[PDB]
Design an enzyme around this catalytic site. Structure first.
Site, short mmCIF file in Angstrom:
data_model
loop_
_atom_site.label_atom_id
_atom_site.label_comp_id
_atom_site.label_asym_id
_atom_site.label_seq_id
_atom_site.Cartn_x
_atom_site.Cartn_y
_atom_site.Cartn_z
N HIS A 156 -16.36 1.95 11.86
CA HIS A 156 -15.49 0.83 11.71
C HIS A 156 -15.14 0.47 13.14
O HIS A 156 -14.87 -0.79 13.26
CB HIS A 156 -14.17 1.59 11.15
CG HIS A 156 -13.09 0.76 10.90
ND1 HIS A 156 -12.08 0.56 11.97
CD2 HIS A 156 -12.80 -0.27 9.87
CE1 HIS A 156 -11.25 -0.47 11.89
NE2 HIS A 156 -11.61 -0.96 10.44
N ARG B 205 -9.59 10.51 15.55
CA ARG B 205 -10.29 10.33 14.09
C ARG B 205 -11.51 11.02 14.03
O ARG B 205 -12.64 10.63 14.39
CB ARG B 205 -10.26 8.79 14.28
CG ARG B 205 -9.02 8.12 14.44
CD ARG B 205 -9.27 6.44 14.90
NE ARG B 205 -9.65 5.66 13.87
CZ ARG B 205 -9.93 4.34 14.21
NH1 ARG B 205 -9.78 3.81 15.30
NH2 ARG B 205 -10.39 3.32 12.90
N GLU C 265 -12.97 7.43 6.63
CA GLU C 265 -12.02 6.55 6.36
C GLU C 265 -12.06 5.51 5.39
O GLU C 265 -13.47 5.05 5.14
CB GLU C 265 -11.43 5.79 7.61
CG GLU C 265 -10.82 6.87 8.81
CD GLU C 265 -11.03 5.91 10.16
OE1 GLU C 265 -11.14 6.93 10.86
OE2 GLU C 265 -11.36 4.80 10.45
N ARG D 168 0.74 -1.24 0.08
CA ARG D 168 -0.04 -0.05 -0.13
C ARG D 168 0.83 1.20 0.09
O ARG D 168 0.22 2.28 0.15
CB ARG D 168 -0.97 0.14 1.20
CG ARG D 168 -0.27 0.29 2.58
CD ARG D 168 -1.36 0.22 3.64
NE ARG D 168 -2.06 1.57 3.41
CZ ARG D 168 -3.11 1.64 4.13
NH1 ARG D 168 -3.91 0.35 4.95
NH2 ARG D 168 -4.00 2.68 3.80
N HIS E 113 -11.09 2.05 4.45
CA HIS E 113 -10.72 0.75 5.03
C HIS E 113 -10.93 -0.43 3.93
O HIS E 113 -11.28 -0.19 2.85
CB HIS E 113 -11.42 0.38 5.97
CG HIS E 113 -10.94 1.16 7.51
ND1 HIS E 113 -9.88 0.83 8.20
CD2 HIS E 113 -11.77 1.97 7.99
CE1 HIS E 113 -9.79 1.75 9.07
NE2 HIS E 113 -10.85 2.56 8.97
N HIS E 114 -10.19 -1.72 4.03
CA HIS E 114 -10.60 -2.75 3.14
C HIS E 114 -11.33 -3.99 3.79
O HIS E 114 -11.14 -4.21 5.17
CB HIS E 114 -9.34 -3.46 2.67
CG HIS E 114 -8.28 -2.35 1.94
ND1 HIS E 114 -7.64 -1.25 2.59
CD2 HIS E 114 -8.27 -2.30 0.62
CE1 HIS E 114 -7.09 -0.74 1.82
NE2 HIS E 114 -7.30 -1.09 0.52
N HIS F 299 -15.57 -3.73 14.32
CA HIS F 299 -14.46 -4.90 14.55
C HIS F 299 -14.55 -5.02 16.33
O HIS F 299 -13.83 -4.17 16.81
CB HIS F 299 -13.02 -4.23 14.15
CG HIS F 299 -12.79 -4.48 12.98
ND1 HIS F 299 -13.46 -3.65 12.04
CD2 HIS F 299 -11.95 -5.09 11.93
CE1 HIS F 299 -13.26 -4.02 10.62
NE2 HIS F 299 -12.39 -4.65 10.61
#
Lengths: 83, 490
Positions: B485, B454, B458, B363, B460-461, B489
């Site tokens: 996000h 934050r 964002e 990346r 993300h993947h 998680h």
């Protein structure tokens, strides 16, 4: 270099809010540092939303935000600007 | 008023009249110059570590602060002389700042970013060559120049002088109990401008607090900089390995050393055991003469008595020593098994790390955009805070596909630039927000979707980069708000 909103004059504070709105920064990390700083000076509940997600019929141009903070703080028993 | 050397942190108990500091004219030692030169080419180097337990033995009240001082020109690129009188803040290349690292508060020389400090003029006083600088947020700092007495470095049981002058990354919370300023004197004094930082001595409760806050900010930075959060671990996992390997080596030395000591002491014993057998036969020999007190033999017998108790005591001593050596040898043998088991775990850690360090390195290496994305509505950014987030929009995918990007960082900047130009996706962005998207930066979320530092949307993947998941695959990618996000998680 500025721990309370009473360290700022009205015209000094306006500059910070005009920096933030125009995104006049060298990095997104210094922008977010400014916004996080703005938030703390205002102590305002909307928080960052004063800038990026204003209420209906509020003025979101740099000045109108200085104006919203000003009258809110005054109207809830809080210290004002320098001078 | 013996002067304190420049760059050597010392306690000053305040008075009612403020802190008392006495500087010298004599320029700063090889040491600190060294540090500032080294440091020249946010990171920093530790001058001292503080130990409240001790500082209080002498300052029970915990009123004492910690002053450190440098001559301003060594800090500042633009000489303080050639500076307007209207300026309140001169820029500096380094600062002296309290940091919290490894569970002690500590004073240290910081650098590596743009910094700038209060500048305050020093009013004189009745006393001759003695001025009063008052730095916002510290006490009245009354100074006193002295080039008569030879310079001293003060030594207090609380303040230590950490030899290890490695440059380490510095605290996120650096400076949280420090007030510094370049102080200038009035023109008809001939005294050079002096830098002074004045830090509070944190109590251990307050240090655990800073420590905590320090760890939390590190978490954030770790999730918002995967590129190199991983590249940091690879250093820790490699260091831990290189250390653990030496452990094996030092153990081997001890255990290979214990094998000779065993062998040596073993034969020392054997010998000593033959000597006993010899002497104990010699007593059997003359046993005859045992009850005849007036015979040649009844001396030669008694003599063998002695030979044996001696030879016997010897054996007892060689035995203790042999046992002892046997113990050492057994312990040693376990020390390698244990120590060498540690290396196997540490060698596995460093593999996992180095694999991740290369996948998370992709990346930051070029590639072409791919995927189709999916249709979206007016509530595009609203969706980034629901479900598994909002996806990349079809219309955006189309405009980007097959284009080459130097780094995924650039791919984000670009995605937002196609959102700023699309009226329906960008329907939710305000004038102030739009200033950021078209300037590259990620647009801000509503308050209720922010988390600490934050505050912006964002990318993300799904199939992560660390599990070999495609960096630039837009069917992969998902726009999420920080909160969303975080929730996803758990």
């Amino acid at each position: 270099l500025k721990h309370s909103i009473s360290d700022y004059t009205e015209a000094e504070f306006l500059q910070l809010v005009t920096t933030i709105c125009n995104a006049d920064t060298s990095s997104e990390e210094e922008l977010v540092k400014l916004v996080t700083h703005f938030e703390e000076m205002t102590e305002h509940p909307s928080g960052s939303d004063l800038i990026y997600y204003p209420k209906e019929g509020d003025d979101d141009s740099p000045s109108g935000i200085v104006n919203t903070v000003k009258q809110w703080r005054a109207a809830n028993g809080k210290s004002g600007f320098k001078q | 008023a013996a002067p304190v050397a420049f760059g050597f942190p010392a306690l000053s108990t305040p008075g009612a009249g403020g802190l008392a500091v006495s500087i010298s004219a004599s320029e700063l030692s090889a040491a600190i110059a060294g540090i500032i030169a080294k440091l020249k080419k946010p990171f920093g180097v530790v001058l001292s570590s503080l130990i409240p337990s001790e500082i209080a033995k002498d300052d029970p009240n915990m009123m004492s602060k910690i002053v450190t001082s440098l001559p301003a020109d060594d800090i500042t690129e633009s000489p303080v002389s050639s500076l307007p009188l209207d300026k309140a803040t001169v820029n500096v290349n380094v600062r002296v700042v309290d940091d919290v690292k490894d569970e002690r508060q500590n004073i240290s020389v910081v650098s590596g970013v743009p910094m700038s400090v209060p500048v305050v003029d020093a009013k004189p006083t009745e006393r001759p060559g003695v001025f009063t600088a008052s730095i916002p947020g510290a006490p009245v700092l009354n100074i006193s120049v002295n080039d008569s007495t030879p310079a001293v470095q003060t030594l207090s049981p609380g303040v230590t002088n950490n030899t290890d002058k490695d440059v380490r990354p510095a605290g996120f919370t650096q400076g949280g109990n420090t007030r510094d300023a370049v102080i200038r004197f009035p023109k008809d004094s001939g005294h050079n401008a002096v830098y002074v930082s004045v830090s509070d001595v944190l109590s251990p409760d307050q240090v655990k607090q800073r420590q905590d806050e320090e760890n939390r900010r590190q978490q954030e930075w770790d999730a918002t900089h995967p590129v190199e959060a991983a590249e940091r671990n690879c250093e820790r996992a490699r260091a831990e390995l290189n250390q653990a390997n030496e452990d094996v080596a030092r153990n081997q030395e001890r255990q290979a050393k214990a094998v000779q000591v065993y062998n040596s002491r073993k034969s020392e014993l054997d010998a000593a055991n033959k000597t006993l057998a010899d002497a104990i036969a010699e007593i059997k020999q003359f046993n005859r003469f045992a009850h005849d007190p007036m015979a040649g033999g009844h001396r030669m017998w008694q003599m063998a008595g002695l030979k044996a108790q001696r030879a016997q005591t010897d054996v007892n001593n060689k035995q203790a020593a042999f046992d002892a050596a046997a113990k050492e040898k057994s312990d040693a043998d376990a020390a390698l098994s244990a120590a060498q088991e540690r290396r196997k775990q540490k060698e596995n850690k460093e593999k996992d790390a180095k694999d991740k360090c290369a996948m998370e390195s992709k990346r930051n290496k070029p590639g072409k955009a791919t995927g189709k994305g999916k249709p979206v509505g007016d509530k595009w950014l609203d969706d980034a805070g629901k479900d598994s987030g909002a996806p990349i929009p079809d219309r955006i995918a189309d405009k980007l596909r097959d284009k080459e990007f130097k780094s995924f960082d650039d791919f984000r900047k670009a995605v937002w630039e196609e959102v700023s130009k699309d009226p329906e996706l960008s329907k939710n962005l305000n004038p102030s927000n739009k200033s950021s998207v078209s300037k590259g930066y990620s647009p801000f979320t509503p308050k209720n979707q922010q988390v600490g530092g934050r505050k912006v949307y964002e990318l993300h993947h799904d199939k992560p980069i660390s599990q070999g998941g495609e960096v630039y695959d837009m069917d992969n990618i998902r726009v999420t708000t920080p909160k969303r996000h975080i929730d996803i998680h758990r």
